[PDB]
Amino acid sequence: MDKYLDQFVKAPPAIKFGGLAFVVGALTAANFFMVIQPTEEEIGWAVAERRK
Amino acid sequence: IKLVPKEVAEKHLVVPVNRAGPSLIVAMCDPSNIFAVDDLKFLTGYNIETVVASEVSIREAIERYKGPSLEDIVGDVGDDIEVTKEETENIDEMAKAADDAPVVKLVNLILMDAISDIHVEPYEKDFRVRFRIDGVMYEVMRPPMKLRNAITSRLKIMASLDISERRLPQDGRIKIKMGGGKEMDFRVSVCPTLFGEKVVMRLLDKSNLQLDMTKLGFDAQPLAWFKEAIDRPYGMVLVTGPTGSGKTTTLYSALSSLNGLDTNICTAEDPVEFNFAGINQVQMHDDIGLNFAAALRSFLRQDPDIIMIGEIRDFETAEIGVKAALTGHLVLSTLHTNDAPGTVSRLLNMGIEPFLVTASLNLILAQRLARRLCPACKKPAECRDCNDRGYRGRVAIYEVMPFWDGLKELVINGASAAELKQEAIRLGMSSLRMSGLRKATTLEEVVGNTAP
Amino acid sequence: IKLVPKEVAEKHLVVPVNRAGPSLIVAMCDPSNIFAVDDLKFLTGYNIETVVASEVSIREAIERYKGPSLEDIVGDVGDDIEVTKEETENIDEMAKAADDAPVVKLVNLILMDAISDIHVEPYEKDFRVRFRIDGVMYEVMRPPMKLRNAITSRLKIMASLDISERRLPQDGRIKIKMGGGKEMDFRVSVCPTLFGEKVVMRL
Amino acid sequence: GFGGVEGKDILVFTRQFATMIDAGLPLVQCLDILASQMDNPSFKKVLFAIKSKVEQGSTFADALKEHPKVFDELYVQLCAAGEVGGILDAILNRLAAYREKNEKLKSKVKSALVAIGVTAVLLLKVTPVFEKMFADFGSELPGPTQMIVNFSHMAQEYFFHVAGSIVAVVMSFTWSYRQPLFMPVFGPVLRKVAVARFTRTLGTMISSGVPILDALDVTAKTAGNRTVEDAIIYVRGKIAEGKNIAGPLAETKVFPSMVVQMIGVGEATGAMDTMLNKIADFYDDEVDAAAMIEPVLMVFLGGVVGGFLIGMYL
Amino acid sequence: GFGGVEGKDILVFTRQFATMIDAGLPLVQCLDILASQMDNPSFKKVLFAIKSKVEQGSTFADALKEHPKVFDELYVQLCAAGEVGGILDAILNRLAAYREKNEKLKSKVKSALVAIGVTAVLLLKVTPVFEKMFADFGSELPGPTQMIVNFSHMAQEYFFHVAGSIVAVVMSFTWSYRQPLFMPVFGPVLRKVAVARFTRTLGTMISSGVPILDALDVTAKTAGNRTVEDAIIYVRGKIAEGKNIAGPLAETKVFPSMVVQMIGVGEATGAMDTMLNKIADFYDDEVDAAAMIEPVLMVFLGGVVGGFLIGMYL
């Protein structure tokens, strides 16, 4: 059905770009958390080693 | 409602709108397009009934969509006639914002279901009508039993009555808000009407006919002057005629045409039908549990110069009426009958004598409907009541004017100027003569110019 | 009721007195004064219906706006017809001393509201009468729905009966204390009289 | 020494005055009508005497003062407050509602120490006694303790059963106190009370001489239940349009087949007053008699008992 | 799995069949009438199905066999014994009396092995169990002995308590057994039951289409109370002479002013069928309310229990 298809020729450059952007934002949140966790683990191994 | 894809409806500008008697009702803008029709036949697998509609109305319905109605029904504040139509409508719009959040102005159907002859004979029978020029013609409107029954209750209720298997026939009147009236006969179920429920509507449409109706050839100007006179010196008159010959119209015409600004007039009706452009007037309507006699009895009590009784149907009121005539009021009314034994019989059968009616009744007009194929003609077929006779046959009647249908003409039949003399004197009688030969269509304006 | 400033009413001796059928009823002493009328038209923005009234009656209404009455009403010992009129009147005078400490003798209105044909057909319709010599003539007396209803109960009650939507028509007789009678037909609401409540009196 | 009148009989008469007065009948004519429709002599007799004072010009409050043993100081003062403020109609409506609440409250303590009091002690503790009886059949039941515990601990553990007994009590008290989505399906419709009031009001205005349509226009303004008011506006609209009274009624479920058949006879006989008066008194007596108020007792009666027994069992 | 019907509802329907059949209506027309007068659907629905078998030519006993969960083997066999011997009328009268005694006996245990049997064992020993169990809380109570006495003497001294328990039993048995000169002044006259039965029977034969006089001639042969039978013969004799039904009734005290006034409407309305149906339902419900059969139970219930406990303590 075509009215939706020309709503698809007018707009979803914007909507596809937006979706890509929200995804990349999520993935950057994830990798920043995945660099914060090795920090904590690392301070932990510090505290063990010094106790040795 | 259901179609194939919404896109297909919009492209072809067609919309299914119901399914009845194994067929799919399809509203279609281009019913000559066999490609689109055959596409719909193949895709639905259903047999079609085609209904032509304006392109933009179909498009509007496609985008808008018996459901939105199924909910707006449960809104008591809508059906209520006590509420002015101007506001009621607003509620329906705002309430409709529920679905899509706009105001739709003018939902044709949503309004069509909330806010000269129509013959509706039975179930699944196409309605017939009488067109102002075309006469009897068939119509594209049919209702099966369920729709018939629903119409039937609708019309019954708007006319103020309750048709049921206990009371299957109903002879009421619809009051269109435009003050206009219409006679409605109606039957529920099949107990009287084997062919199913049925209704007939003989449309009035009013705002009240005037003496401008010597246009319609009904009464000659000469006779209308004679009546103008007659009504000024308070000669009492009854308009008799078979059903729908014009009794009420003619009556209302005669009162409306006169200047009644200087006289207290005074009307008792079972429902409103009478419109008068006059100030000294008391309009009285039968209410629950009141007889016509209650209102007349108590009304004659004040000082009416003129008394108008919509139509005499309980003759206990008839009796009060002719009593009013004998005190010397100007009384006027309507009666269902076709000639002189018709009325007199009809009048005498709840106990007024012809000395009291015929002796105190002055003039009796007889109205008709004449048809010559498709002309619709309402004419005054004819009557001066002279009095009673001692030792007799009674009712002494001098026929002033007859109507010949063969030439559509009003003839004078042995009336003389010495007859209508009945005047208190010379100057009074002279005034009658002047009005006889010496004496703008709207009622307001016509009254306005008889006033002068 | 509403006007522009109270001062303007008093200066021009005019007073609006109702709003009906999109028009403002304006009681006016000098209806030939197009300056005042056009001032009222412009200041209110409303279409006017002009009613002529005596200057002092307009002024009186402006200043009242029926208080002295709003209190003398709550005096059961006044309406009571069992009491001779000669004494009842006295109470109304002495009770009126409350405001300013005199006896007013003969308050026309205070009495007019406590102590050959009249046709009163509907709401906002000028009364008609039958004069002993002039016959059917129009009159300068009109009542809107509220006043009609009030008259209607007044006349009904003095004639000894109770008109209501349950018993909307009433055919009684008033006994004037002067042993004189009058036939009164009367209707409340619009149920039998679409044109509103209404009354007739054949004196 | 003189007594008042019954709670029932004050009720009927205050209702029917409030109804007539709010109809715009003259107060003396209201008084005449209720006297003339009364079944007990003492009522018809007083109300002629109250009316006799009102026709001498006295207020209703001052006329009722001739019967201070029947209309107490609080009743007259409510009337007189209505008369002084121009609200006699709305204070009589208030007094009619008051008298109705008073009679209903009277029947409903007294009904069943009389018999009701003895039967209500007796039902309220029957079960909780059975219960203490099965739990006193020795030691080492379901949920108990051994007797050698310290008393306070023993009593606190059983708190379960002390609680199941109190709940049993509260329930049988509730049944004795009470008892003496399709959105439209959820609204309170017309009851027996509301039909009895309607019928009495109409029987009353017709017996007095008002037409049907004048009585319906008054009644449609004095009906308390909103759905009935909507029903009655539709009945009056139908009748005013020329439909037959029994046919406007037959559309509405609240009027039985007979109420309609009886009204339908009344239309053809000119005896609608008599018909409505006998319908109303039939309904008023059906109302004061009033079957689900006894079945739901028993549901909670044994259902709570059984809940206790199961409670400690487990 | 299917259940029967209530004791009330078997009652009403067996009474009204016995009545119609003893009137000499055809069995199928009897069946139609009681179905068409029924208030519950399940009854109207069955009775259409029982009638459907009777119109295929089956006996009533064999038609009721389609509802063995409602009409047990003993009921059908009574019917079938009546049909085989030419006494269907008198066995239905017997069955109606049976069903009436069954419903009354049900209300009246339960109020305040089936349910009656289980509840009656359970009430008859509740207290005496309580009692034995307080008297088994250890030794050296009020009135006991020490256990070392010889058994025969110990048992004989307690004879007090064994006696207070038996008396407790006899009492609760009495409440369960009872609880389910001007010579003419001493005769049992018409009761509430007998008026309710009369009214139901007449409501029944009128709703079916029999005239008043045909219904009265049947009823005057099927009335159980002799004084009422004498009353009804006088009512029928008066009506057959041309006196108006409400006027023959008004001579007899058993018909209230409301009953007569309601019947007097029904005469002018051609709605006597239903006036009688509503009167009968009102009476049947007044009957089943009529409550002292349960309060006096409880008086003797706890009063005896308490008398035992007091007895030994002292």
Tab-separated table of C-alpha atoms in Angstrom, chain C:
chain	number	residue	atom	x	y	z
C	1	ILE	CA	-29.715	43.673	35.999
C	2	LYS	CA	-26.526	45.403	34.645
C	3	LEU	CA	-25.639	48.927	33.286
C	4	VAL	CA	-22.297	50.727	32.772
C	5	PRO	CA	-21.286	52.718	35.920
C	6	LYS	CA	-24.041	53.326	38.418
C	7	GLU	CA	-23.211	57.006	37.885
C	8	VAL	CA	-24.031	56.775	34.176
C	9	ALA	CA	-27.450	55.245	34.914
C	10	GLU	CA	-28.245	58.013	37.354
C	11	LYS	CA	-27.013	60.783	35.043
C	12	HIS	CA	-28.951	59.540	32.020
C	13	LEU	CA	-31.885	58.093	34.042
C	14	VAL	CA	-31.872	54.711	32.296
C	15	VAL	CA	-31.565	51.206	33.650
C	16	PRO	CA	-31.226	47.829	31.965
C	17	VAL	CA	-33.811	45.459	33.391
C	18	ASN	CA	-33.353	42.146	31.555
C	19	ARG	CA	-31.837	40.312	28.592
C	20	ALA	CA	-34.134	38.330	26.327
C	21	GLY	CA	-33.994	37.066	22.772
C	22	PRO	CA	-30.514	38.371	22.277
C	23	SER	CA	-31.507	41.916	23.328
C	24	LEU	CA	-30.924	44.046	26.421
C	25	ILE	CA	-34.151	45.498	27.813
C	26	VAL	CA	-33.371	49.105	28.746
C	27	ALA	CA	-35.809	51.227	30.733
C	28	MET	CA	-35.262	54.800	29.578
C	29	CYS	CA	-36.788	58.129	30.550
C	30	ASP	CA	-35.601	60.133	27.516
C	31	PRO	CA	-35.825	57.777	24.510
C	32	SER	CA	-35.436	60.726	22.109
C	33	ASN	CA	-31.820	61.213	23.256
C	34	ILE	CA	-29.821	59.519	20.507
C	35	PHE	CA	-26.557	60.487	22.221
C	36	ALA	CA	-27.386	58.504	25.361
C	37	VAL	CA	-28.781	55.572	23.390
C	38	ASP	CA	-25.735	55.367	21.131
C	39	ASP	CA	-23.498	55.621	24.202
C	40	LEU	CA	-25.278	52.616	25.723
C	41	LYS	CA	-25.129	50.700	22.422
C	42	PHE	CA	-21.385	51.249	22.153
C	43	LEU	CA	-20.527	50.641	25.805
C	44	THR	CA	-22.534	47.432	26.175
C	45	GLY	CA	-22.030	46.066	22.670
C	46	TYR	CA	-25.568	44.717	22.957
C	47	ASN	CA	-28.626	45.299	20.849
C	48	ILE	CA	-31.228	47.223	22.821
C	49	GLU	CA	-34.964	47.001	23.339
C	50	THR	CA	-36.170	50.346	24.675
C	51	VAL	CA	-38.965	50.642	27.249
C	52	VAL	CA	-40.169	54.075	28.337
C	53	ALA	CA	-40.568	54.631	32.061
C	54	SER	CA	-41.307	57.559	34.355
C	55	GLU	CA	-38.073	59.279	35.389
C	56	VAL	CA	-38.536	58.888	39.145
C	57	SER	CA	-39.533	55.228	38.829
C	58	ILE	CA	-36.307	54.523	36.922
C	59	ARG	CA	-34.279	56.422	39.508
C	60	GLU	CA	-35.995	54.518	42.319
C	61	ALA	CA	-35.232	51.180	40.637
C	62	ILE	CA	-31.575	52.139	40.103
C	63	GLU	CA	-31.151	52.943	43.793
C	64	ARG	CA	-33.046	49.849	45.029
C	65	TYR	CA	-31.089	47.602	42.798
C	66	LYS	CA	-37.003	45.733	46.608
C	67	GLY	CA	-34.483	45.466	49.458
C	68	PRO	CA	-36.862	46.976	52.056
C	69	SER	CA	-39.323	44.517	50.565
C	70	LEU	CA	-36.854	41.580	50.675
C	71	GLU	CA	-37.009	41.923	54.472
C	72	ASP	CA	-40.631	42.937	55.038
C	73	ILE	CA	-41.479	39.692	53.173
C	74	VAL	CA	-40.210	37.534	56.080
C	75	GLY	CA	-43.091	38.931	58.123
C	76	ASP	CA	-45.834	36.273	58.219
C	77	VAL	CA	-48.089	38.709	60.112
C	78	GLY	CA	-48.364	40.695	56.879
C	79	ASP	CA	-49.513	38.300	54.165
C	80	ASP	CA	-52.099	36.824	56.550
C	81	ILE	CA	-55.485	37.686	55.061
C	82	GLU	CA	-57.200	36.732	58.344
C	83	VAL	CA	-56.010	40.120	59.646
C	84	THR	CA	-58.030	43.199	58.739
C	85	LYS	CA	-56.251	45.360	56.161
C	86	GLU	CA	-56.545	48.405	58.449
C	87	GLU	CA	-54.130	46.889	61.018
C	88	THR	CA	-51.850	44.874	58.694
C	89	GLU	CA	-50.940	48.100	56.942
C	90	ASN	CA	-49.860	49.597	60.279
C	91	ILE	CA	-47.372	46.797	60.829
C	92	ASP	CA	-45.841	47.444	57.425
C	93	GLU	CA	-45.369	51.143	58.267
C	94	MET	CA	-43.876	50.606	61.734
C	95	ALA	CA	-41.665	47.787	60.442
C	96	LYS	CA	-40.462	50.171	57.733
C	97	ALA	CA	-39.366	52.615	60.466
C	98	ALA	CA	-36.431	50.195	60.889
C	99	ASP	CA	-34.406	51.831	58.114
C	100	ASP	CA	-34.788	55.573	58.690
C	101	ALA	CA	-37.069	55.994	61.720
C	102	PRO	CA	-40.200	57.517	60.345
C	103	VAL	CA	-43.578	56.228	59.540
C	104	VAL	CA	-44.032	56.362	55.791
C	105	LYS	CA	-47.737	56.558	55.126
C	106	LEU	CA	-48.904	54.937	51.887
C	107	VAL	CA	-45.929	53.223	50.397
C	108	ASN	CA	-47.493	52.725	47.008
C	109	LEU	CA	-45.378	49.711	45.999
C	110	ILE	CA	-44.992	48.139	49.479
C	111	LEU	CA	-48.788	48.142	49.567
C	112	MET	CA	-49.106	47.237	45.875
C	113	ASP	CA	-47.317	43.982	46.607
C	114	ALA	CA	-48.778	43.124	50.046
C	115	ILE	CA	-52.376	44.355	49.769
C	116	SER	CA	-63.489	45.129	32.384
C	117	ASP	CA	-61.213	42.442	30.868
C	118	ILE	CA	-57.539	41.712	31.489
C	119	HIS	CA	-55.854	39.443	28.966
C	120	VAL	CA	-52.459	38.166	29.874
C	121	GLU	CA	-51.503	35.729	27.200
C	122	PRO	CA	-47.828	34.823	27.382
C	123	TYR	CA	-44.289	35.482	28.378
C	124	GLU	CA	-43.030	38.922	27.312
C	125	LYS	CA	-46.349	39.763	25.740
C	126	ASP	CA	-47.949	43.094	26.414
C	127	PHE	CA	-51.201	42.750	28.303
C	128	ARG	CA	-54.364	43.558	26.476
C	129	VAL	CA	-57.614	44.831	27.921
C	130	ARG	CA	-61.221	45.625	27.135
C	131	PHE	CA	-61.918	49.239	28.040
C	132	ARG	CA	-65.454	50.369	28.853
C	133	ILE	CA	-65.302	52.715	25.823
C	134	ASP	CA	-62.133	51.832	23.896
C	135	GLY	CA	-62.504	48.055	23.798
C	136	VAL	CA	-59.510	45.972	22.827
C	137	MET	CA	-56.315	47.905	23.410
C	138	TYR	CA	-52.675	47.047	24.030
C	139	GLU	CA	-51.033	47.943	27.308
C	140	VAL	CA	-47.672	49.045	28.649
C	141	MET	CA	-47.592	46.047	31.019
C	142	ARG	CA	-45.441	43.007	30.139
C	143	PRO	CA	-44.031	40.261	32.290
C	144	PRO	CA	-41.180	37.931	31.449
C	145	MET	CA	-41.338	34.322	32.525
C	146	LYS	CA	-40.336	34.892	36.152
C	147	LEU	CA	-42.783	37.739	36.719
C	148	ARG	CA	-45.505	35.898	34.856
C	149	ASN	CA	-45.033	32.837	37.074
C	150	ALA	CA	-45.164	35.042	40.179
C	151	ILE	CA	-48.375	36.877	39.135
C	152	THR	CA	-49.802	33.538	38.284
C	153	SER	CA	-49.315	32.021	41.694
C	154	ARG	CA	-50.420	35.305	43.305
C	155	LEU	CA	-53.783	35.367	41.512
C	156	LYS	CA	-54.213	31.622	41.906
C	157	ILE	CA	-53.687	31.824	45.673
C	158	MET	CA	-55.888	34.865	46.303
C	159	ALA	CA	-58.653	32.979	44.448
C	160	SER	CA	-58.078	30.032	46.888
C	161	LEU	CA	-56.480	27.367	44.726
C	162	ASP	CA	-53.068	25.778	44.007
C	163	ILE	CA	-51.934	25.844	40.404
C	164	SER	CA	-48.968	23.657	39.531
C	165	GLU	CA	-47.587	21.458	36.790
C	166	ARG	CA	-49.837	18.760	38.235
C	167	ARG	CA	-52.877	21.065	37.971
C	168	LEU	CA	-51.917	23.593	35.310
C	169	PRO	CA	-55.323	25.116	34.586
C	170	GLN	CA	-57.438	26.935	37.073
C	171	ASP	CA	-60.834	28.498	36.861
C	172	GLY	CA	-61.540	30.333	40.038
C	173	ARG	CA	-62.964	33.585	41.317
C	174	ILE	CA	-61.341	36.390	43.248
C	175	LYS	CA	-63.379	37.943	46.040
C	176	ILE	CA	-62.317	41.555	46.367
C	177	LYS	CA	-62.917	42.607	49.985
C	178	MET	CA	-65.413	45.056	48.465
C	179	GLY	CA	-67.645	41.981	47.980
C	180	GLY	CA	-66.835	42.292	44.297
C	181	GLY	CA	-66.048	39.246	42.261
C	182	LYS	CA	-63.985	38.407	39.210
C	183	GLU	CA	-63.617	35.340	37.040
C	184	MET	CA	-60.025	34.177	36.679
C	185	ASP	CA	-58.720	31.623	34.252
C	186	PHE	CA	-55.180	30.735	34.711
C	187	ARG	CA	-52.391	28.447	33.452
C	188	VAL	CA	-48.964	27.613	34.893
C	189	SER	CA	-45.874	26.507	32.938
C	190	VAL	CA	-46.179	25.786	29.203
C	191	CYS	CA	-47.625	22.303	29.369
C	192	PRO	CA	-51.066	23.387	28.252
C	193	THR	CA	-49.986	26.887	27.168
C	194	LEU	CA	-46.892	26.648	24.957
C	195	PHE	CA	-46.705	30.413	24.969
C	196	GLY	CA	-45.939	30.180	28.659
C	197	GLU	CA	-48.021	30.776	31.723
C	198	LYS	CA	-50.996	33.049	31.310
C	199	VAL	CA	-54.113	34.454	32.948
C	200	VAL	CA	-57.377	36.185	32.067
C	201	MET	CA	-59.736	38.182	34.283
C	202	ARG	CA	-63.304	39.156	33.370
C	203	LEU	CA	-64.073	41.840	35.954
